[PDB]
Amino acid sequence: EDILERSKSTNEIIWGVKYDTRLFGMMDIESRTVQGFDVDIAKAITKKILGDNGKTEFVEVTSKTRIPLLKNGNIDAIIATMTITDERKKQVDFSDVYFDAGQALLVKKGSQIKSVDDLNASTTVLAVKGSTSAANIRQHAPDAKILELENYAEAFTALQSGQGDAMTTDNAILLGIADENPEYELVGGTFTNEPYGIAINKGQENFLKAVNQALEEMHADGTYDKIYQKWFPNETEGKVE
Amino acid sequence: ANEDILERSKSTNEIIWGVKYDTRLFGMMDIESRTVQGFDVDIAKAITKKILGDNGKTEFVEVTSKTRIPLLKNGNIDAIIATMTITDERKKQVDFSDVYFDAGQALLVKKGSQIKSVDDLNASTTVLAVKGSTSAANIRQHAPDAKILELENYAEAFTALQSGQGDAMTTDNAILLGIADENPEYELVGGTFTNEPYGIAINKGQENFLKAVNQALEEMHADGTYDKIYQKWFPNETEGKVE
Ligand SMILES: N[C@@H](CCC(=O)O)C(=O)O
Ligand SMILES: N[C@@H](CCC(=O)O)C(=O)O
Ligand SMILES: [Cl-]
Ligand SMILES: [Cl-]
Numbered sequence A: 001e002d003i004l005e006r007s008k009s010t011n012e013i014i015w016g017v018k019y020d021t022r023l024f025g026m027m028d029i030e031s032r033t034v035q036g037f038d039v040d041i042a043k044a045i046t047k048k049i050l051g052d053n054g055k056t057e058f059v060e061v062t063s064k065t066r067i068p069l070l071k072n073g074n075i076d077a078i079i080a081t082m083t084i085t086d087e088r089k090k091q092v093d094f095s096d097v098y099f100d101a102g103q104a105l106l107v108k109k110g111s112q113i114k115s116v117d118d119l120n121a122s123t124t125v126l127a128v129k130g131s132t133s134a135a136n137i138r139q140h141a142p143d144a145k146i147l148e149l150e151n152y153a154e155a156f157t158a159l160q161s162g163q164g165d166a167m168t169t170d171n172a173i174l175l176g177i178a179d180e181n182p183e184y185e186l187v188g189g190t191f192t193n194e195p196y197g198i199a200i201n202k203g204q205e206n207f208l209k210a211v212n213q214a215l216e217e218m219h220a221d222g223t224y225d226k227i228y229q230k231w232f233p234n235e236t237e238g239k240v241e
Numbered sequence B: 001a002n003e004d005i006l007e008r009s010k011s012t013n014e015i016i017w018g019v020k021y022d023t024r025l026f027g028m029m030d031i032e033s034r035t036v037q038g039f040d041v042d043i044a045k046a047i048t049k050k051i052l053g054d055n056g057k058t059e060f061v062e063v064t065s066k067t068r069i070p071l072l073k074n075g076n077i078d079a080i081i082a083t084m085t086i087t088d089e090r091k092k093q094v095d096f097s098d099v100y101f102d103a104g105q106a107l108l109v110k111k112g113s114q115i116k117s118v119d120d121l122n123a124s125t126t127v128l129a130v131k132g133s134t135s136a137a138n139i140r141q142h143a144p145d146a147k148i149l150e151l152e153n154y155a156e157a158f159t160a161l162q163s164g165q166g167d168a169m170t171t172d173n174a175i176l177l178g179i180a181d182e183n184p185e186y187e188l189v190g191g192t193f194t195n196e197p198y199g200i201a202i203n204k205g206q207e208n209f210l211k212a213v214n215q216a217l218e219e220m221h222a223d224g225t226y227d228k229i230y231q232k233w234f235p236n237e238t239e240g241k242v243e
């Protein structure tokens, strides 16, 4: 079914977002609503496509569940800190890039670790089980011990308790943890490129074109820049110019 | 300059590209064959064949980071494809194509250096960059205490590194790789500390040519021409590829 047609009929686009990723998609206990950069970009795209009265629905996805839910039609699009990769394009299409992340390290302030180069056989790195981040750290720091945890929260609790010397995932995700926990900081720049895209099921070319046209309009009229400034007021590197 | 580049091509069957002549892997003059070679050169040739068809001709003109925008805006070249990062400040001067390479600024040091990342640059360290370059400006932001010695070109910056006139050299990671492959005593350290998405720059008021360049890139991504060219130049480096 053509999602562009259906979404006009139901006046709604269904977005798969994270619920546990501060700055991108986080379930907010105060308002009982999900918030972040991915959420606000979804809302803005939906208004470009459907008009100012268009509705958004958000459905919680993880890195593990997002493509299966997309392929089964539970959601119309994934916007969930999702890197565009050739491997994933065997399964989905992607929009234009809307954020430029990169894999990085989070440590306790005062750590002797200042770069991925410092992750030798003496170090233990925390990563999420099944993630691209875990796979990447094994190639970039082949002698480090990797401890895999269920999710970001569990990885950060293990870092705080000293079960590992560093935690790894995308820089902008780690930022959402560092700004909340000032005893921790990012170190060493990035050692991958993680360009985020919006994933759409194969065979939805009309909807993909509409999403890309929405993004184009948002870049042209400053909506994109406003949303970026809101969530990343002191870090410009991730912005798509 | 104001003459429309696609209209002119109806007569000349040519696109004139501004490329580096000194940047191994991107645009480098080969002395034996007297021809420039690199990823940027190959992308330019492939785009020209998409726009003009099978017998479309390419012409290459040397630019530097200093001369590329002046030459473009004066009409000496039709487009810049020369390791050029897209920035909003540059978008005041030129239009840009879609991103065709994903670089990032990095550091090159002698193996064994105490410097392991941008975090180790400070008032006691001298970093080598090219005069007037954005790389020098990015260092002043990410290493605000570092001393900067700006040199006229990459070759000069690298010999200054080799003779200890600076402690680290900085420019885009993919460019430093072109240097580290030539010089095994030196290595990249610390990953990247900026994003440097490369675009093709086109003068303002050339919107039909800009659309043609973007359509050419679209076609090359759709049919694997882009991927083949990427694999030729960066067979063991995956991160710069635009998917
Ligand atoms: N952006 C990376 C890591 C974060 C995530 O999985 O959401 C990826 O898509 O693999
Ligand atoms: N890509 C960076 C550094 C290389 C160059 O100047 O060509 C820039 O456009 O400034
Ligand atoms: Cl050497
Ligand atoms: Cl590809």
Ligand SMILES: [Mg+2]
Residues within 6 Å of the ligand: A100, A101, A102, A190, A192, A193, A194, B103, B104, B192, B194, B195, B196
């Ligand atoms: Mg990057």
Ligand SMILES: [Mg+2]
Residues within 6 Å of the ligand: A084, A085, A193, B238, B239, B241, B243
């Ligand atoms: Mg990639």
Ligand SMILES: [Mg+2]
Residues within 6 Å of the ligand: B221, B242, B243
């Ligand atoms: Mg591709």
